[PDB]
DNA sequence: ATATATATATATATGTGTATATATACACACATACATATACATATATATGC
DNA sequence: GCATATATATGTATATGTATGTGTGTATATATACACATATATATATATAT
């Protein structure tokens, strides 16, 4: 991939025992032994004299880096890319989620309220995620800016609800939001 | 049935019936060769050229 | 995510009660102390502290 | 094989074990009839066919030859650099033994009554020129995975490999380069077309020969493709990409059956040097059928699709231009600059951790 | 037949609130593990040996 | 036709040496994203007109 982008020209003088594999002599076999100990080429500071060069270099480092996006592009298995993290970090995901029954989603405010709550829950049927802080101006927006951000979209992603249509693959059942008791 | 009849030749009968090995291609075609300096896509036949460098290398053998 | 496991919440008045159902292809010793013994290795219930 | 229709050497024993080469096939014989050295000596056939070279049944017509030997040296090449060489022929009604020993300075032609009818070549190779001592496992693979592409190409011929048998598909070696080669079998060529990550790959067979550095027959089969190939992805995804970008990340596996006027540039037969009218007049491969195939695969194309477009936009995102004096080189948000920094001058940086500790400093410093 | 006069919703932004998070050094003296390889025993088998 | 023998190949089981901890908080700082509105501003889109 380095040497692919070099146009080189050798130029070999009194050499000896020059053997070929054709009549035409296209291609030397002579062994490199013996032109090892012929060519007394310094290859070291024409790499030096390369390294001080920048326009053949910056081919080089722009081909090397697109070799690498697409060596690292397309790699990896099991892609059944659905749910990347399920629910979230933070939700607790109840035991008959997913499945008919009363199954009861908590959206509490504050990351710090998520003591106590895993504690005597309904470990089948109740479930929770905390919310972050205050909420956006959701009213008559357009679905694509409102999908940008990360807090409304998972609710839309722990479940199986939609924007652009109506409900009927509830992970939770029962929605219960409660709020701080404050203004 | 192919005629299979063990035939001896001398030197001149069998460069001029078996022209591949000793003067290389003997075809027009394409290849892509530095003419001036120009990395040109050609098209030739290689064993005029090659015709011609034989003298060519003896006289810079000479 | 190795299809060994499929674990679930019972917790209570007191906490940690997970609830596992294991998997068909995870193999359950009957050798009961073999299975004291790798239920150690890979559940890790000791901890050990010096 | 090819020279009795493959009714006979249609089975090739070739047992290569502890330096020693046994090639043993059913064919109907090398002649026993008398055929004559311009010279004036009087030397029976498979003799003058194994000892001195320019001799063989390959010197007629070569427009309909079909086979894959033209010089009528190479046996006797073999023979010349052996330190053993036997070759036991037989007609049906005679077998003919020559020995050759001492890289053939002694050679001995004899004739036994006998019944056999084939020939057996088992010869030792010498290694006084050669650059080795030893046949090692690499010779071996080399051999088994050539009676593997022969059998390939040929399924009638069974070839054996140290008494093993070897069964050749086209199927099975396509997949054997990739698992998602798309193939193509005509009544003279067999093409699999896969893929190639790190260079270019290429294998090609005209007749039973290993072209391993080309011929015109590549060529004209690559530009027949890339003729149909290249308008098509310029419809499909409207990028320019070249012939040789598109051939280089393919590996192509075709096979030449029947080929007629085989010319080669050199002795070992590594270059197809044929007219292009001979091998397009042979050659009647479907190159479009190739073309939508690997267009209809999102295995092959689109690799290269998608890989084209990194490319592209690795090169439209270096993008860079000029600024009027620019500040500390790369400077920070909160790096307020001394104005003779850079230049020849005694000028000082200043660290410190907070943000509160430097509001006062842009009016009590120089 | 496009140059320009002009009009109007984009971008901070102020302060108040209400809530998140994150890179690190510290160090034992183990804890768990991450493979891991590696050397050696023994099995069968098959091909030599008889 | 049958003894047999040893050879190497693969289980296997341990024992190596590392590798990653994070521990468990203290300690240091910093960042984040929203709701509440008028006031400019700006910049570019359309009309027209000769
Ligand atoms: N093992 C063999 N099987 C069949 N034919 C053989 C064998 N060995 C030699 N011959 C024939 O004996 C003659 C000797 O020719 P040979 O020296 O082998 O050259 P060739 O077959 O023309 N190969 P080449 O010189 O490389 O083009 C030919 O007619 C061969 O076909």
């Not at chain 3, 292809?25 to 502290?49: P, T, V």
């Not at chain 4, 020969?209 to 149909?228: A, L, R």
């Not at chain 4, 940086?349 to 943000?355: H, R």
Request: a positive charge; proline letters at 2%; aromatic letters at 8%.
């Amino acid at each position: 991939r380095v040497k692919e982008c070099l146009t080189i020209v050798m130029f070999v003088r009194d050499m000896k025992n020059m053997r070929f594999d054709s009549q035409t002599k296209e291609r030397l076999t002579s062994p490199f032994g013996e032109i090892r100990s012929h060519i007394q080429l310094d290859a070291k500071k024409i790499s030096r004299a390369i390294l001080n060069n920048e326009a053949i270099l910056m081919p080089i480092i722009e081909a090397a880096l697109a070799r690498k996006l697409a060596a690292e592009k397309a790699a990896e298995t099991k892609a059944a890319k659905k749910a990347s993290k399920a629910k979230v970090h933070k939700h607790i995901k109840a035991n008959l989620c997913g499945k008919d029954a009363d199954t009861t989603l908590f959206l509490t405010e504050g990351d710090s309220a998520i003591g106590y709550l895993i504690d005597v829950r309904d470990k089948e049927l109740h479930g929770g995620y905390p919310l972050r802080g205050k909420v956006l101006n959701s009213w008559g927006m357009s679905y694509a800016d409102m999908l940008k951000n990360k807090e409304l979209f998972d609710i839309c992603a722990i479940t199986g609800l939609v924007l652009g249509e109506k409900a009927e693959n509830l992970n939770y059942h029962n929605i219960a939001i409660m709020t701080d008791a404050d203004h | 049935m192919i005629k299979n009849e063990i035939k001896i030749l001398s030197d001149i009968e069998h460069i001029k019936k078996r022209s591949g090995m000793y003067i290389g291609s003997s075809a027009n075609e394409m290849h892509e060769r530095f003419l001036f300096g120009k990395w040109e896509s050609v098209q030739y036949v290689p064993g005029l050229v090659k015709l011609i460098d034989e003298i060519i290398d003896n006289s810079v053998d000479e | 995510n190795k299809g060994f496991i499929t674990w679930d919440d019972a917790c209570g008045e007191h906490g940690f009660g997970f609830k596992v159902k294991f998997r068909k292809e995870y193999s359950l010793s009957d050798n009961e102390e073999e299975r004291h013994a790798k239920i150690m290795k890979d559940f890790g219930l000791i901890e050990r502290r010096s | 094989g090819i020279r009795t229709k493959f009714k006979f050497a249609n089975k090739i024993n070739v047992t290569i074990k502890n330096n020693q080469v046994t090639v043993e096939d059913n064919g109907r014989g090398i002649p026993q009839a008398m055929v004559k050295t311009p010279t004036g000596e009087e030397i029976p056939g498979p003799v003058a066919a194994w000892t001195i070279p320019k001799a063989g049944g390959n010197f007629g017509d070569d427009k309909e030859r079909v086979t894959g030997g033209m010089n009528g040296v190479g046996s006797s090449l073999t023979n010349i650099f052996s330190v053993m060489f036997v070759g036991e022929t037989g007609d049906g009604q005679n077998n003919i033994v020559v020995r050759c020993s001492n890289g053939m300075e002694n050679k001995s032609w004899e004739t036994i009554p006998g019944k056999w009818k084939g020939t057996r070549v088992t010869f030792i190779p010498d290694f006084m020129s050669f650059e080795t001592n030893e046949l090692s496992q690499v010779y071996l693979d080399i051999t088994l995975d050539r009676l593997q592409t022969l059998a390939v190409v040929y399924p009638d011929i069974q070839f054996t490999f140290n008494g093993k048998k070897v069964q050749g598909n086209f199927k099975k070696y396509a997949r054997q380069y990739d698992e998602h080669a798309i193939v193509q079998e005509q009544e003279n060529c067999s093409i699999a077309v896969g893929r190639s990550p790190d260079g270019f790959r290429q294998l090609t067979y005209v007749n039973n020969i290993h072209t391993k550095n080309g011929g015109h027959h590549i060529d004209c089969v690559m530009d027949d493709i890339c003729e149909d190939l290249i308008p098509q992805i310029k419809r499909k995804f409207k990028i320019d990409v070249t012939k040789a970008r598109v051939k280089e990340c393919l590996t192509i596996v075709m096979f030449v059956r029947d080929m007629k006027n085989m010319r080669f540039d050199s002795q070992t037969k590594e270059r197809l040097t044929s007219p292009f009218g001979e091998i397009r007049s042979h050659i009647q491969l479907d190159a479009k059928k190739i073309s939508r195939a690997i267009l209809n695969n999102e295995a092959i194309l689109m690799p290269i699709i998608e890989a084209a477009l990194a490319r592209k936009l690795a090169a439209e995102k270096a993008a860079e231009t000029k600024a009027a004096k620019k500040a500390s080189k790369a400077k920070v948000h909160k790096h307020i600059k001394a104005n003779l920094c850079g230049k020849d001058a005694d000028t000082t940086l200043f660290l410190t951790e907070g943000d509160s500790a430097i509001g006062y400093l842009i009016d009590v410093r120089d």
